[PDB]
RNA sequence: AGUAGUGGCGAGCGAACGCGGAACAGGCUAAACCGCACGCAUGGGUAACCGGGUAGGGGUUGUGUGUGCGGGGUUGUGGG
RNA sequence: UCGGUACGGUUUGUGUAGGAUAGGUGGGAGACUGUGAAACCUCGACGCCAGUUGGGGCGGAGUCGUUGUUGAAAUACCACUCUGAUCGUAUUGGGCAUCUAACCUCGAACCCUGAAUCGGGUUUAGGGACAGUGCCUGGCGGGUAGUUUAACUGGGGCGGU
RNA sequence: CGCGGGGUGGAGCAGCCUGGUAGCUCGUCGGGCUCAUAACCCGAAGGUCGUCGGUUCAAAUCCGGCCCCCGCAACCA
RNA sequence: AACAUG
C-alpha cells in the first residue's frame, strides 16, 4: 500500500511525496499517529 | 474465537481425507485476530475478533 | 607476460556472448599480431565421461581441412604395402621397422596398422604413449583397407575423445584460413556433437562453448545458434 | 433413460442436450456527472466566482476534497 | 554477523629420474626490463615428499625459461577444467542483538460502581514481533475408535498340508 | 523402489575422502632373556582384500555387474 | 617406577 507522509519521518524519506510501505508500518505507526494520510484522495490535494 | 464481528464469516465444515481415503470431519476456522479499534482518532478502543482479511483492507482503524 | 595479457581485454569481453560469425572474426584479429596458431574450439558436454556406457567417442571430417602435414606411417608388407604405395605412404619400410622406431626415431603424424601387423606393432605403443601415436581400431586406423585410410588422414578426419571431466577440444584449422573455411569446419562440428549425444544423458547437453587460441585468450561463444553457421 | 457414463469398474450409484405439456411478467437500485447541507484544507487580485453569453459592479467566499439527502442513470445490436 | 549460487581474479595439488609426471585433456614449441627469496626480500598453510615465484612493500641498468633428456613425460608459453583456500561483483537465504507502535499480562492505581476477588474502559509498570490462534505440512500417538485374525481335521488344539 | 554406507589372514580389526607397503592384536611353532620356571621380547607360517570387467602406467581404494548385511524413507495390478 | 616363585 502506498501512503502520504506529513511530517519527517527518518528513512523513509522526505515531506509531500508519495512511499511505499509494508502495511504493518502504516496502520500501526504511521496511521494512528497522524504522521501519515492514505493516497486515494490526497493526490490532488497535493495538487 | 470463529466469527468475524463486521462480516459474519463463520467456520465452514468439510472432512479430512486420509491416504486409505477415510473420511472424517473436521473445521475450516477463519483467521480471527483480535484488535483495539478506534471510532476516530485519540478516542477510546473497543476490542473485537475481526478476520484477517479485513485487517488486510481498512473496514477497522487503530 | 606484459603484452599478450594487455592484447586479451582490448578486443574481446567476458560477459557478452559472441556469434560465430564474430568468434572466427576475432580468430583472426587475436593471432595476427603473433605467429599462426591452431583456433582451438573447448566444449563444455553435460555428461558424466566416467560411466563407460555414456563414453563419447566419434570422428568428424574437416571439408576445408586443417592445414597439417600428415606424415602417415602405414605398418604393411607384401601387397598390403602396395595398396598404401598408390595412397601416399612417404615412408614404405620392411620387417626392422620394429628397430627403427626404437632407436630414437619419431618422425611420423599418423600411424596405420594392417591387421597382419598387429602382433609386431604392439610392441611399438608403449613408446608411443603420451603424444598420442599409437594405431587405435576404434578411431579407424587398424583396417584391411589402408587406400582410403590414407586420405582421411590428409583430408583432416579428427578424432575426438571427451577427456576426464567431460571437457572437449577440438581444432578447426590454421591461423591462415579465412572467416568461411574455418566456419565450415565449425558449422560441421557442433552438428556431428549433437549426432553424438549419448542416449541416457538428461539436462542441458551443450551448456558451455568458447573459441581460444595456442598463446591466446578465449573467445565466449553463444550454444544458442546452431543452424546459421553459414 | 436404468441410457451416456460412474464404481475395492465389486455391491451399487446415476445425469444432461432436447422434445411434449401446466402456467406466463417483469420491475427497481450502485457508479460517472450536476446540485444542497455538514466536515477538512488552501487563497486574498495569488485568483476566480456571483445561471450562460453580452456590459459594468460586488471587491474574498472562490477552489479542491470527505459524508449524507435530491437530480441524472439502467445496458449487450454494448448502454450511460 | 554468517552461508550457496552464477560469473570473474589470485592461489593450492604430484614416486627413484624432471621447474618435485602441466594434477588432467587438447592445442602449440621463443618469450620479454626475468639481477638473486645474496637485497629492502615471497607467502596464511606448503619449510614432509620439493622448498613453491608471489607480499613486485623492489633492483630495473642489461640477460635465464622455450634448446638437452628420464620414469609415461611434457617443462617457456599456455588452455578450461579438478581438490583446497581467499578476494571481488551480483543475487538469494539463515542465526544473534537493541528499539516501540501491533499483540500479551491472574502486575498496580482510578473510574463505570450505590452494594463488585466478575467484566469493560483510562493511565502507569513490564514482556514484545517472540508467544497464542488460523491455514498448509512432517513427526509422535492403544489416549480413543471401527474391524480383521482362513480351511481340512475319525471332536477342537499342536505338527503337517 | 529411491538415497549412502559395510564385507580384509584361524579369530578380532586398522588401511578406503590422498590409486601403489597390504598390515597390527590374539591363537600355533621355533628362538631369546633367567641359576631355573612363569612374565616379557623377536622371527617365521598364515591373504581368491565378498565376486567380474572395465577405466587405468598401476586398483583393497574409482565406476558399473550381480552376491549376501544394515540404516532411513517409500510400497492403491 | 616396577612385579612373582624355588
Ligand atoms: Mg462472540
Ligand atoms: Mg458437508
Ligand atoms: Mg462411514
Ligand atoms: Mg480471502
Ligand atoms: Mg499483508
Ligand atoms: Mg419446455
Ligand atoms: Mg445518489
Ligand atoms: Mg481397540
Ligand atoms: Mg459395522
Ligand atoms: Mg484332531
Ligand atoms: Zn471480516
Not at chain 3, 612417404?90 to 620387417?95: I, L, N, Q
Request: hydrophobic residues 40%; glycine residues 10%.
Amino acid at each position: 500500500m502506498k501512503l502520504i507522509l506529513t511530517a519527517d519521518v527518518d528513512h523513509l524519506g522526505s515531506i509531500g511525496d508519495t512511499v511505499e510501505v509494508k502495511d504493518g508500518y502504516g496502520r500501526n505507526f504511521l496511521l494512528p499517529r497522524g504522521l501519515a494520510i492514505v493516497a486515494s484522495r490526497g493526490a490532488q490535494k497535493q495538487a | 474465537a470463529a466469527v468475524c464481528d463486521i462480516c459474519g464469516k463463520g467456520p465452514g465444515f468439510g472432512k479430512s481425507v486420509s491416504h486409505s481415503h477415510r473420511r472424517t470431519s473436521r473445521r475450516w476456522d477463519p483467521n480471527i485476530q483480535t484488535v483495539h479499534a478506534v471510532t476516530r482518532p485519540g478516542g477510546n478502543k473497543k476490542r473485537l475478533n475481526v478476520c484477517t482479511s479485513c485487517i488486510k483492507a481498512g473496514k477497522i482503524t487503530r | 607476460t606484459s603484452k599478450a595479457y594487455r592484447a586479451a581485454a582490448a578486443k574481446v569481453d567476458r560477459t557478452n556472448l559472441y556469434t560465430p560469425l564474430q568468434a572466427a572474426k576475432l580468430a583472426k584479429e587475436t593471432s595476427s599480431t603473433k605467429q599462426d596458431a591452431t583456433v582451438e574450439v573447448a566444449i563444455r558436454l553435460g555428461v558424466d565421461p566416467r560411466k563407460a556406457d555414456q563414453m563419447v567417442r566419434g570422428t568428424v571430417n574437416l571439408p576445408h581441412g586443417t592445414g597439417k602435414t600428415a606424415r602417415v606411417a602405414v605398418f604393411a608388407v607384401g601387397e598390403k604395402a602396395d595398396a598404401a604405395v598408390a595412397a601416399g605412404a612417404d615412408v614404405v619400410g620392411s620387417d626392422d621397422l620394429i628397430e627403427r622406431i626404437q632407436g630414437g626415431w619419431l618422425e611420423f603424424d599418423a600411424a596405420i596398422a594392417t591387421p597382419d601387423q598387429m602382433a609386431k606393432v604392439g610392441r611399438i605403443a608403449r613408446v608411443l604413449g603420451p603424444r598420442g601415436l599409437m594405431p587405435n581400431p576404434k578411431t579407424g586406423t587398424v583396417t584391411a583397407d589402408v587406400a582410403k585410410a590414407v586420405a582421411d588422414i590428409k583430408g583432416g578426419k579428427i578424432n575426438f575423445r571427451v577427456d576426464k571431466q567431460a571437457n572437449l577440444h577440438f581444432v578447426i584449422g590454421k591461423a591462415s584460413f579465412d572467416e568461411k573455411l574455418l566456419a565450415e569446419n565449425y558449422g560441421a562440428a557442433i552438428d556431428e556433437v549433437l549426432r553424438l549425444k549419448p542416449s541416457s544423458s538428461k539436462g542441458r547437453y551443450l551448456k558451455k562453448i568458447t573459441v581460444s587460441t595456442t598463446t591466446g585468450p578465449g573467445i565466449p561463444v553463444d550454444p544458442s545458434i546452431t543452424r546459421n553457421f553459414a
